[PDB]
Amino acid sequence: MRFTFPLMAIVLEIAMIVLFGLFVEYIFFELYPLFQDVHVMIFVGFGFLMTFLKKYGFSSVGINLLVAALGLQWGTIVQGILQSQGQKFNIGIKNMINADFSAATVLISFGAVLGKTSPTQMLIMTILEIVFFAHNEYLVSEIFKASDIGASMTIHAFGAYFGLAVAGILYRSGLRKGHENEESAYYSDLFAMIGTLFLWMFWPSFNSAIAEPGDKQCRAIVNTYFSLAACVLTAFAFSSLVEHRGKLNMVHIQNATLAGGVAVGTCADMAIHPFGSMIIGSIAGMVSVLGYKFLTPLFTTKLRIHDTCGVHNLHGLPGVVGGLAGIVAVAMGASNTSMAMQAAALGSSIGTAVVGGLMTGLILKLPLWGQPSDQNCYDDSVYWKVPKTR
């Protein structure tokens, strides 16, 4: 109504403080550099990656900051309660990294509904999605006992599919044929390049933070590094291939260059080998560019689901590919654990993402959170003081 956003945020913060007081108490310095790289990814990479919209940079980066800052606290609480089964627990560097991972999942989902939601809706979606994500990742890691060290399934596919389901519930007809504000600018694309480059550079730390120290962590770093390297080449090549007169598209360069990092995640600590990691990255970049070119218009115009950042083409399809790659590696016998449990983890991630997104989007649909009108979508001025000068 006016005070809904500050009231909900202060109530949530007081709840976080009470939960931390009731449940949270006080290897660290070895893993802290990797946590710093992950933190920079969460708050700079995603935040500035979503600033490609010419009239939504403020909301992109600021709502990214708000969502991730709330998400680290809420993910700490939920993941710790799940691990301790309801008892008081201590927190270390791993809890910090896992909470940042939960924030990353919420940010991936946010990329689907970017420019069409209010900050209040974003707080609600953060709170609900972290619960769904934490339950799914607990199932995958403890019941299925699958290997998802880079979280192609539990983070990327989950966030993509959960975001798409929220977008379909929130889909607006006036936006199907495009919007005048759903549109990029030169310097906005340069800021998006800041975000893309930081994500691309710090992805090896992202995929290797929770890996077992020694051979597995080094393997994850090397595999992510070379997978991203191959993915850049294939993303550039197919962006040239699919576009008019061979001109490169900044959407592809901003997003599809990270698909190799997304898709190598499940196999990151496995002995895929550098050539095997490179092959997955090349497939990832190809698939991401083709998704951006062909599947996104199909999803928007006929699917009725609008995905602003194209997070499907970066997180969902490369995530499914990463899960498929992990099942193939078990068939290879490079990695332990069963094929059936990897497939179960993939299916559970997708299904829980779609179900939780549908319920969360049904909650977000209510006309109480100050969501923008159709004409005011992708506009900072709905919630921010926008300077007259660009």
Binding site: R2, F3, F5, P6, M8, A9, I10, L12, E13, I14, M16, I17, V18, F20, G21, V24, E25, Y26, F28, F29, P33, Q36, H39, V40, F43, V44, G47, F48, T51, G57, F58, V61, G62, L65, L66, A69, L70, L72, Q73, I91, M96, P119, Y187, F191, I194, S381, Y383, W384, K385, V386, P387, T389, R390
Partner: protein, 380 residues
Amino acid sequence: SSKYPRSVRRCLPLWALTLEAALILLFYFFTHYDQKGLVASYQVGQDLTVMAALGLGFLTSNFRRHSWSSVAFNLFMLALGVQWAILLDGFLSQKVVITLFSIRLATMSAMSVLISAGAVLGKVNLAQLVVMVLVEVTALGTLRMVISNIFNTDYHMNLRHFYVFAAYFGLTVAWCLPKPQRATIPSLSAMLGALFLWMFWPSVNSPLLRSPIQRKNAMFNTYYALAVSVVTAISGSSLAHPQRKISMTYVHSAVLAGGVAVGTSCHLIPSPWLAMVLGLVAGLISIGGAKCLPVCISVMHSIFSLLGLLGEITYIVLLVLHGFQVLLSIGELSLAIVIALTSGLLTGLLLNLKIWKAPHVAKYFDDQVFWKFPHLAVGF
């Protein structure tokens, strides 16, 4: 007088080159050189350097036509301040042995000046900033040495007061200056700087902690307090604004609220809930300062000063739990504030001198005063 800037072609190069030659000579005469955690210890100082250069240089780049000067002048000030701080902490705390720890401490001394300069950026030229760097580093070193002599604390450990010293020094210097805005892309660059500052402020809250468990607890408290402060600052911005919208300028500084609130006591906070409470209270105080201080020049520097004072007060409250010590700590804080204000007065009176060729008050916040641009008429 002429609003056209006077030529600095003889003042600025001579000043900078003489400063660099003097620094090199002093380093030759007084500085001297000299494992397993070499990279780990280097990373803390690197994080301080990343904050000092990127976060502080870009945080003030939000001005419409003063982003170049903010970023580049911050870089120049950092480069001068670290060298001069190395020499000064060498002189007042003994030859000067140069280690990564000494570079880290000199970087902290430089960041004090870099924070203070935000209250005066857009109203001074490079030579005035050189004077401010030299005098402020000297004053901070003098304050630390005085506290070490009186209260028997370590000279390096007294650098904890640098938030409150920097805030009041900058406010005082800004008050002495002659009396006199945003754009979208500079606002996004300033958000980049603010994000880097917010992300690495736990490295500000524990460079001086030798013990590992103290560093761990302080880092955890800073991280959680900063998260709470970000949420409170973004949410409550709409309350403290006439148009009920979120102010990017307010967010850029109010994100750091919890970090400042727990800066001097994060090692003594035993549970994350208390640090989270302090971050929430810092965010609420930031809302109130944004809404109330303009009624009673830089408002963000004013609420920074209030938050540094609040951090000192919560240090006083916590230090009893872990009344003569209260009197000693209050005297320490009062001495710090008094020296900050007095040295700020002196710096402002020095900056008002004619020889600095300061920009005309009608030309504040404008890169054209200091920078070359094409298709301009030059000279007379």
